[PDB]
Design a protein around this ligand. Sequence first.
Ligand SMILES: COc1cc(C(=O)N2CCC(N3CCN(C)CC3)CC2)ccc1Nc1ncc2c(n1)N(C)c1ccccc1C(=O)N2C
Length: 265
Amino acid sequence: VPFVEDWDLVQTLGEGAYGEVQLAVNRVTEEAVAVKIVDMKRCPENIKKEICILKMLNHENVIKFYGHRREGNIQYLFMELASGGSLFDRIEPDIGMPEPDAQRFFHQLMAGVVYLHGIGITHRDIKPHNLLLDERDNLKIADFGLATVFRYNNRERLLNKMCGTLPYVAPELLKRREFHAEPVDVWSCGIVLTAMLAGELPWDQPSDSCQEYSDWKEKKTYLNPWKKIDSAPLALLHKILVENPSARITIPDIKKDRWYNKPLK
Ligand SMILES: COc1cc(C(=O)N2CCC(N3CCN(C)CC3)CC2)ccc1Nc1ncc2c(n1)N(C)c1ccccc1C(=O)N2C
């Protein structure tokens, strides 16, 4: 039975490259939090950056950082517990989920992304495994290990590093030497929305050599996953998944969309 200062580490909630996440229970107060354990030896620069960004975050749709402790080579990051687990586990394969549930989660995801963008942070790996749920099914954006600053002192910096998850990544990230941060997070949110409504990802990657990607650019929406999605949400996906990032819809314009504003069950 291991432990750190006043807390005991009681079960493994997830694993991952750098380490694992444990459910941590304060023996005394009985509060329960999640602890991300990282083996600094197994990079120490990387956690310096992650903790720094983590301390900036204060929003109801973003995971909260409570503090940390270095104990020799291991860093313990104390963070909010999302006891409903992941959005990934609410998606039925080949089905999706009810449209009203998808719309609610989409609203919550936009609120968290507008918050991050407004403090000049980009997440860079939005996908259902990184979107967690509290006990009342409120969404929380999680995993800031690839996050970075894109605006500082009111001045934007373009990105150049390749990163993320291929099926969710925007096409400019594969084709351009440097690109703007915000339209890349908007694109990944569009892939999430397709997942929630269809239970299927549309392509392996958004390249000219991928047939499924070519089929979309040729507007063949009688094919899957598109043919499973109602016309109203499909019209929003046509404005998000636009190849040219400067023609792609922005978040203030998403908030004006017809489906975004439709009252549902
Ligand atoms: C009790 O908290 C968690 C539980 C589980 C999990 O295995 N289940 C099993 C099914 C369970 N029920 C759902 C409701 N249903 C009616 C019954 C079944 C939901 C929870 C998964 C994750 C939980 N919480 C959690 N918090 C923060 C993380 C993190 N993980 N990890 C692992 C992360 C994973 C991805 C990205 C970021 C994190 C992370 O940084 N933290 C802090």
